[PDB]
Design brief:
part of a larger assembly, 5 chains, A mainly alpha (about 50), B alpha+beta (about 120), C mainly alpha (about 50), D mainly alpha (about 80), E mainly alpha (about 375), E: mainly alpha, Pre-mRNA-processing factor 6 (chain A), Pre-mRNA-processing-splicing factor 8 (chain C)
């Protein structure tokens, strides 16, 4: 109750610290696994005859 | 005029050639902007001359460079407007001091030397 | 590790394989995973660098 | 005295002039004063732009695309010559 | 020897120039005060160099006793105090109460560990007395340096008024002392002043950031230390720059009242306020509405490249084809939910092996390439 009207007037608007890249990030696109993975998986499992 | 202390002040004719040479050196990356870089070059002994502006409210911030030049035997010259010097240096922000640096087999050599002579002709 | 180590390459190959096994089943990759895979492949193409 | 400008200002001025010219051409096309631009076709671009029609008569298509390439080349050369 | 000559030179200098400084200090307690100030601010460099000579001699002598404490203790004065509190007695290393006030607890542990299994032999009596007199003279010169820095702090109001206004008087005295003088400091670049008095603190297994390297007396000043750590280094740079300006004014004796000092300190405070200002109000973007209809998207070389990158490859197309009836043993122990499908499986319709579409090669971003080139 002791707060004066001027002190009420002085409360500042809350601001968000994080910048644009965190507030509104660009879409995180997805990409398929490279074919090198399937190539390595298939090459592995081959057995030497000796 | 505005800076009566700037005894080695260049005339209007010399300022145009000075700024043209500064811009050409910036094209060849032979220019160092700012008083600190000029001092660093003078200490390294790689500069040949210093072009400084006569408009600066704490003017003595550049006054260290001339004396050091007399220590390192390097010509120095004063210019009227810091904004023009900065524009010649390739920086929109005002620049009060710039230095020109030596490169092995530089194409600017002769022009440099010419301006050097002018400074010695301007001193007293 | 000396500049002329005999096993300077086998260890790098094994380390790259261990790092790559993190995505042996990942059908989708975000930016971090694809950057990691790109770094792994770039290191695999130029082992000396 | 003449005043220089930083490389940033040079890039911005060139970009603004180029964008102005492109918008000018596009709005000229909008108002019908200019025909819509034709695709720029080269030898590699041939089968992509005129693929459905190069099978009709390939030699005429080759002549047309070579004529377009030569028109661009000769426009460049005549601009240089007039600037000489 | 070198110690004897250095001590004699230091005593000769202290009997004359330090005595003159003492008389000048006691006068205020035609021979103007300016020459006394200048000779004191040169005496600081003289005693620093002779203390460096003393420290080198002490290092050379103590290498026989303890050839490792040099790397463990980088500071010269800390080295001298350490050898004073250690001497030939290395078993004293345990729980030294006196070592706490000189060395940090991080490095006392390291020096005790090293002295536990060191190969340094014990010095003889002549080495002990030589080292003891060397350390005593070194600490006497350190006390002289402290007194002369107190004198310079007292004279701060006269030598460099603006620069004393910008930062602490003790910091101003220390930076002029390490720089070599008001003129010597004013001739230094701003990027170098902030590096004054930056001891090469050794990382005791910790990261370099814990050491806080490239940090000078300006970084430890009053105003700089009143900032959050993430805002510290930058602040130091700013202060250094302004400090330089003050020197470049004070070395020419301008604004002796300190008007340039206020004109720089107010803008320093303004920059600090701006850096510490509360973040502004930023509206949040509402989620875009779902899309319907058709949106015209262009084609061309970029579209072709993106389609090639995101398109289905032959090996990938053969991967998600699973043979009916013919059961395949799971070749991935770590996960049974992963299979190659027809890839490598009988009846796949490919006599030869399906090659790798190199259009799907994994490569780094442009900015990652830039960073790698920088880190090369």
């Amino acid at each position: 109750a002791e707060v004066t009207e001027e002190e009420w007037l002085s409360i500042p608007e809350v601001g968000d610290a994080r910048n644009k890249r965190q507030r509104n990030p660009r879409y995180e696109k997805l990409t398929p696994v490279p074919d090198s993975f399937f190539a390595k998986h298939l090459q592995t499992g081959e057995n030497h005859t000796s | 005029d505005v800076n009566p202390k700037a005894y080695p002040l260049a005339d209007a004719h010399l300022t145009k050639k000075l700024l043209d040479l500064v811009q050409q050196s910036c094209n060849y990356k032979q220019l160092r902007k700012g008083a600190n870089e000029a001092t660093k070059t003078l200490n390294r002994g790689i500069s040949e001359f210093i072009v400084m502006a006569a408009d600066a409210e704490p003017l003595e911030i550049i006054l260290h460079l001339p004396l050091l030049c007399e220590d390192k035997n390097v010509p120095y010259v004063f210019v009227r407007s810091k904004q023009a010097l900065g524009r010649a240096c390739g920086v929109s922000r005002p620049v009060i001091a710039c230095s020109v640096t030596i490169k092995e087999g530089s194409q600017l050599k002769q022009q440099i030397q010419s301006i050097q002579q002018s400074i010695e002709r301007l001193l007293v | 590790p000396p500049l002329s180590y005999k096993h300077d390459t086998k260890l790098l190959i094994l380390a790259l394989e261990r790092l790559k096994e993190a995505y042996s089943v990942k059908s989708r990759l975000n930016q971090s995973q694809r950057e990691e895979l790109g770094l792994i492949e770039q290191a695999y193409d130029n082992p000396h660098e | 005295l003449g005043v220089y400008l930083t490389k940033k200002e040079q890039k911005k001025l060139r970009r603004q002039t180029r964008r102005e010219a492109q918008k000018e051409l596009q709005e000229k096309v909008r108002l019908g004063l200019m025909p819509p631009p034709e695709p720029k076709v080269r030898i590699s671009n041939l089968m992509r732009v005129l693929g459905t029609e190069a099978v009709q008569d390939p030699t005429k298509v080759e002549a047309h695309v070579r004529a377009q390439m030569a028109k661009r080349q000769k426009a460049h050369e005549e601009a240089n010559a007039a600037r000489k | 020897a070198k110690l004897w000559d250095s001590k004699m030179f230091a005593e000769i200098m202290m009997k004359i120039e330090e005595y003159i400084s003492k008389q000048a200090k006691a006068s205020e307690v035609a021979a103007p005060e300016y020459r006394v100030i200048v000779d004191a601010n040169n005496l600081t460099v003289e005693i620093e160099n002779e203390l460096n000579i003393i420290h080198k001699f002490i290092r050379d002598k103590y290498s026989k006793r303890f050839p490792e404490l040099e790397s463990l203790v980088p500071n010269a004065l800390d080295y001298i105090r350490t050898v004073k509190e250690l001497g030939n007695s290395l078993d004293k290393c345990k729980n030294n109460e006196n070592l706490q006030q000189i060395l940090t607890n991080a490095t006392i542990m390291v020096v005790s560990v090293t002295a536990s299994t060191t190969q340094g032999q014990q010095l003889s009596e002549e080495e002990l007395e030589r080292l003891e007199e060397a350390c005593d003279m070194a600490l006497e010169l350190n006390a002289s340096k402290h007194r002369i820095y107190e004198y310079v702090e007292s004279r701060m109001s006269f030598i460099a008024p603006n620069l004393s206004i910008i930062i602490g008087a003790s910091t101003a005295a220390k930076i002029m002392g390490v720089a070599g003088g008001l003129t010597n400091l004013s001739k230094m670049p701003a990027c170098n002043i902030m590096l004054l008095g930056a001891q090469r603190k050794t990382l005791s297994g910790f990261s370099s950031t814990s050491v806080l390297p490239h940090t000078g007396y300006i970084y430890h000043s009053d105003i700089v230390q009143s900032l959050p750590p993430d805002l510290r280094r930058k602040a130091a740079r700013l202060v250094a720059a302004k400090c330089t300006l003050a020197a470049r004014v004070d070395s020419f004796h301008e604004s002796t009242e300190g008007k340039v000092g206020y004109e720089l300190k107010d803008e320093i405070e303004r920059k600090f306020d701006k850096w510490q200002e509360p973040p502004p109000v930023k509206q949040v973007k509402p989620l875009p509405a779902p899309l319907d209809g058709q949106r015209k998207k262009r084609g061309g070389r970029r579209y072709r490249k993106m389609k090639e990158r995101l398109g289905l490859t032959e090996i990938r197309k053969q991967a998600n084809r699973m043979s009916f009836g013919e059961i395949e043993e799971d070749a991935y122990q770590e996960d049974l939910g992963f299979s190659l499908g027809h890839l490598g499986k009988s009846g796949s319709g490919r006599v030869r092996q399906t090659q790798v579409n190199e259009a799907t090669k994994a490569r780094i971003s442009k900015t990652l390439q830039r960073t790698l080139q920088k880190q090369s």
